[PDB]
């Protein structure tokens, strides 16, 4: 009944030392059915990264959006969508649906192609911007993921070191929660390479 | 939330907390919720937190124009007018309750705002969860003729009954001075009295704790020449 | 909320308590229920704040255009302005006006419009949820024709009253008084009107 | 959560998964939804925890008044029956309650009764309930025979409720089995879902759809 | 309409070591988004070596805590001053429970000791009165976020032993009572900087062989 | 299960070095109409406490009969009655406690919060509260209702914690408490100028004041306050 | 209606959807064939609420028909799934939505794959090998997850469905009259005319 | 309903309204709400008039026993009675009665029990629907220690209002006056009051 | 539960009830036998409320058996079926009634004649030439009302209970497992195990 807790699925972002790292499940179920465990909920639109939780179709809409938008964005700028402009489409496309939302909890992670600083955000189904500095959560266990991240996460990790904090934070809260877990992925970004690496984790 | 606006001899100070929430869970530690409408008119917000920064950058934006068009510096009440006709015709649906204050070719000034589009008129106001915390410290030290060392002192003060009393509230003060003949001077983490204690363990992991499956290098480059 | 208009021989003068309420927290202790639409056409206002301001408002306006064109207006068109915006927006507010106003032609007027949006021109009238306890007050004490001195005594032992039995009217006593010498407001602190 | 009970050559085979849930949350993994009756008899625990405990631990002492007075084991008859009358007087208050009486005697053979709260009481050979059911059904039906050896009968039962425990999101966390002879029951052991899974999907080549 | 039951916030955490147990609860009592009390004792030593906590309305957890205190009084008169072991209390508990089974103590109740081997107990109830042995229990308000770190940081779930890739499970090694104190104590600052009920003060109850002991820790009282 | 009819609103109160301090107007209110002028919420219980009501007066008034009760059958049979055998503020307020949780119980609650002040045999200050649902917590300040909201935060500026108490003298706690009833009343629609303050100190003993005002109200400033935005004369 | 299961194997989808049509309380119908083409090489099922699956299915179905015809070119699966994706997802916001649930069975001549995507109301699109709507999947998944191998053969496939609707004659309280079973390959769509 | 009893020099009086309304009818215009419980000892009865025809008759069995076994029982002690009943039976009670009394010891005394069965002493009280219209007036005018004559005007002219603005009050204001020198019934007609 | 029939014909009366017992989205058995022997001549089946149904059941059969032996005597099926229809009658007005319906079928030895007695759970009785209980009757009357002959053999009597439920069959969406079909006549109780 309750939109946002129908598909269930968990994002998770972090900084780190001259990177960013997003995480997600890859479960999508209709409530207590597991239907898929290939779902991910991560895209990205050039170097800016968005993890989507919530109802399932509106992740799949939204992603088309912003995919659709940041090209034209592109074609008429000549250059590549930065994370903090991002952030703020965003915020505009999920306001302008104020009374209609979409059912989602969208999280955006990258970095600044120009100044190299490290950019993660965090939205409500309504546009409002969480701009925090260590780590955003999203999902059906993002109480758990609070959890975890605030006594997991420490500043300035090296990426191979925010890997294991992002990656335990993910699993631990996804194993507490009925609706999130059937695989999941990380994503190690900085200035330019990005790693993705899928998690062996338990399968009920 | 807890939000204040005190008037003093010059000018307009307005003062926050920086605590925002869903439910009991703590979303952000350090929220920053004095949003400008315009260089020396300031705003804050209590209630939902969109539609208090979606109804400040559009009245701002509005603001910014009529600026432009005029020649001349915005004012308040302008501000004030603009926001309330907006809010009244969304009948409460837009959850802004805000306290905006500021400085203009008239003077100084300090209105408070409600969803339904009502307002009004004081020397203090206080909005939010922590708006009765912080009215006590109001109603108990407030006087006539404030300087501008007491008002900044009173508004954070009651900020910090907020803080201290109100589930709702907590973290850090913020603070804007907007006086006469002066650039509003904004005041991020005026206070910080609420820094975690160091914890007790590292929890940093050893490289290769987490098991993998796959790994490869993401194409975030666009399609390449030759 | 107490709110009270009443005509005497000079003029009107219009009355308020200054407390508004949000539940039983008092959200302003200082309000401004005296409202200027016109030079010397006011109103008290009660009901949703919301309300009777977006209607004082746009009453204002209605009158600073009529001004422009045709001069100023009676206190008679300035309540049928407010009649016209309370009636046939009925199913969308809460909003219980007083007009009152001073003409030179015919002196002071009240108008009172309820709820429904009918209008009703009276000596005096009272409103607001703390009125309820002073019709029996009112009716013995008012005369027609009284001085400045004894409509202002009038209306402070009236809202006196009013406030002293209701729980959402307090603060100052508040008036504004409409005579062809021109406005003056008047305030009442409550060391002095709760000793009467 | 998922429980089966069947009957077969060999006995009874019980099996049930191990997680408990309040709404998305998952409150534990280490759920006992066997109640240890008595040393012969065994309950599965579905629905509500407290009146499962509660009232299969009370079954336990009216059977062991039962015996002490007759001087002779109780019927799985006569045993489900005093808990179904029971909680047949209940009805309406809102217990909730699903559950197998297990049990292997002399007179009866190996005996299977589902017991209801709202007093539905009925033999069988297989039963399966709780919110991975369906589940765990599918794999029985399929693969069930009487002639099972004990090896294989107690392996479908495992293999059973990983099956709902993958799929069903309120099922998971371990297996436990149970083994119900003539002479007692006889406890196979936790079996961690998570490792299980891989176990299983490796040695069996199922799950081709789960990447490991 | 008059609802009986309220809110009180709080959180407490049990943890069971090799020959201890410890019982922690935050000290802050609330309403809504008013605090009550910054130091309103939740976690009581009951008598033999039973320690005790139910979390959640604090009217039906003080009347349990005291009708359980009371039973072990009358089961010392009535059965000879016998020492009531952990297992028993337990039992007793759910029975206390589940005889307002259609109008419960809207609590989750923790209690903490010692087995009769002196190894460390921690037993965990429903507010019907279903009951299980556990190594580690969260409850109340933070239990969601604590739990999870919990898993992670006492049960190693999750994390495997450098090099092998996933093949082998870090080892299950004892925790020592300082070693879970810093942990119970690292639980309730992460919970207190993201819960708005979690707050004030931090009071655990340590149970050995010796006796129980208390330790307080002051927590951010925003 | 009923509603409140006539009712009274705040009791605060607060620990101070030798005593408690309480304090409660001399309102009835029935809904918003203020009924009742001369209602008096703070009730001595011997020489050594005083219990602070608010609520439900006609459930009140039955509380203040049953501790009325408690005191007669107190004295029966017992020499002691007037010294070692007194009624303590803990006995008090754990039997009005008991009722209190007894009554939720029987969903039949007397719809009250109580705050039980009072000065034990050994000097201890006590200070307990307890509602309609039998909730009870102790601190070194209580206030109900409103003053929960408005009182607290003033009187924890004074008396923030236990280690406080020692150092708060009770001119110091009195003139919180006096200004926190003038805050109550600028801001509680529900609350009266007139009020009840009681004192009970280790050494001076019971202080009952009876017939308090409100006074060194601020309203000059509202003369300048004019409209509601725009609006200048 | 009921129930709608798929599979894709090695070469070819499967779509096995059932023939009952209940009016409430009578069996108005046991032969009826809850399938559209869209194309030679797409076959779309479906179930839902009464009148809407239909009157969905011959929407897209007339859609992609217009496409075929405008640009002389059979859209991919992938393409004609997002486009009814695409619908259903406009549809869950309007005034008043598609209750209809669909599998769409393909085969890409271009990749030489067989494809089969499930789409619910919502517009909730996901590429499987096996999928089912409503309660179908309960009772089938257990043994598909069991049995399924990418590489099974037509054969196999059809034997591995013929266990599922087993189960499901079994454990399902209602009569959905058996199944309809059409094969979708290389050389197009076809009908199993005894199953 | 108006009802009020007021306490002077004498003894005191009781005052009450003949209206009881089902719904805008009046099912009697001629209501007698001022009920004996004991030769000196009356009440006002407002609410429920199946419930305080049953109180006032449980009362005044009471009060009978009462003084069979120990004299004349006091004003307070009938309002005890009273109290019982409405506050033990509140849930099923919807009563507001005002008790006055004359003892020669204690002499005029007047009790208010309002819906939740507390019980307040007062120097005067009112009650009723009509009693909301003249909280301001009484409040007013009331003096302690008045004479017969002047009690009487008092509380004719109060009423007197009550009636005007209250729909659910008029006919005729009955009086009962209570002294040593027994007990008077007066009645005023809507011809005299309605001219105050 | 859900069917069950009956029908009396010349020398006997035949009970058909179905095996299915369905917990919400489970066929949990496909072989209950919804029916009690009351005594040697007299049978009850019945269909209704979980768990109310077996108790009721269950319950009239210890008192026609207490009865049978304090007389050592067989109740008439007309005094048996008087006695359940009391305690129906008095169960509507309890605090929570018995949910019930129930068909009894007896052989009359006194008078030599067989005899159907349909009892609803409200305490509605009638004697019937055959009866029916729930959706049953809505699609077996109509059968019925045209083939039934007084005089039929217990051998015709089946032949039409087929037919019925090869109605049922057809046009019920539940599956209700096919029926347990008993036979009651002078010689006693006995059941047909092929149907
Ligand atoms: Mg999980
Ligand atoms: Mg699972
Ligand atoms: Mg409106
Ligand atoms: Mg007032
Ligand atoms: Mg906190």
Known sequence: SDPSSINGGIVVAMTGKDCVAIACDLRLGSQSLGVSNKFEKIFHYGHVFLGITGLATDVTTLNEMFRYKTNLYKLKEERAIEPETFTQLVSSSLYERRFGPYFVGPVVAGINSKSGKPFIAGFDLIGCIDEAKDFIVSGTASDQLFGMCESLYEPNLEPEDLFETISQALLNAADRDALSGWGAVVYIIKKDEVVKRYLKMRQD | TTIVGVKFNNGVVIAADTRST??????????????????????????????????????????????????????????????????????????????????????????????????????????????????????????????????????????????????????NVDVCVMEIGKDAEYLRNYLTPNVREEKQKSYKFPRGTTAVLKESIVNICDIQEE | TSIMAVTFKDGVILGADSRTTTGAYIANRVTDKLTRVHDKIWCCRSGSAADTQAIADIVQYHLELYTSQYGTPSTETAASVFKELCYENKDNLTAGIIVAGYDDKNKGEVYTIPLGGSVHKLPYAIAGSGSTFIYGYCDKNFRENMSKEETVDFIKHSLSQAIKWDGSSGGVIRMVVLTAAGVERLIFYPDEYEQL | STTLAFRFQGGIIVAVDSRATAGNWVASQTVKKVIEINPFLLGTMAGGAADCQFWETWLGSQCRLHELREKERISVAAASKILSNLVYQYKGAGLSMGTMICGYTRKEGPTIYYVDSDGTRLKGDIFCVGSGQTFAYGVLDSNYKWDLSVEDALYLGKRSILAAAHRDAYSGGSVNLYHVTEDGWIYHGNHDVGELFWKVKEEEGSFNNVIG | QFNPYGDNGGTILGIAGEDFAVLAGDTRNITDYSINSRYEPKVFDCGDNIVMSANGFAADGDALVKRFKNSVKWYHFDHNDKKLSINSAARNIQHLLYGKRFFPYYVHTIIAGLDEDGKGAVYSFDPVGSYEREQCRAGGAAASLIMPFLDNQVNFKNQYEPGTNGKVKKPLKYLSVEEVIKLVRDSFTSATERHIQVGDGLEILIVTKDGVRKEFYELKRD | TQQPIVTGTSVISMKYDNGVIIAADNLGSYGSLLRFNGVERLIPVGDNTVVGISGDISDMQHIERLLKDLVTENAYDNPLADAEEALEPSYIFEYLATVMYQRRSKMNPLWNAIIVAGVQSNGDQFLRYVNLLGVTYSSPTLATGFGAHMANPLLRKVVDRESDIPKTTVQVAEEAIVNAMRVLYYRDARSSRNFSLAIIDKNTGLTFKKNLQVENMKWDFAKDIKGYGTQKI | MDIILGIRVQDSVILASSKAVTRGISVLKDSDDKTRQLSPHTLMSFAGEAGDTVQFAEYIQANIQLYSIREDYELSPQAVSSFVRQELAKSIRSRRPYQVNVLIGGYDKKKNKPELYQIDYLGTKVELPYGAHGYSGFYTFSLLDHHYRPDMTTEEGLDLLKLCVQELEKRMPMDFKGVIVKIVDKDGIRQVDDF
């Open chain 2, 22 to 171: 869903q439910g009991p869970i703590v979303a952000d530690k350090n929220c920053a919720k004095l949003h400008r409408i315009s260089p020396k008119i300031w705003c804050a917000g209590a209630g939902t937190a969109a539609d208090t920064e979606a109804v400040t950058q559009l009245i701002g934006s509005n603001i910014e124009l009529h600026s432009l068009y005029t020649s001349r510096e915005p004012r308040v009440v302008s501000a004030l007018q603009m926001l309330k006709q907006h809010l009244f015709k969304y009948q409460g649906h837009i959850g802004a309750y805000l306290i905006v204050a500021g400085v203009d070719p008239t003077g100084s000034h300090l209105f408070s705002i409600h969803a339904h589009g009502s307002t009004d008129v004081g020397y203090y106001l206080s909005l939010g969860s922590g708006s009765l915390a912080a009215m006590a410290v109001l109603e108990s030290h407030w006087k006539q003729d404030l300087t501008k060392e007491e008002a900044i002192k009173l508004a954070s003060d009651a900020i910090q009954a907020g803080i201290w009393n109100d589930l709702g509230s907590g973290s």
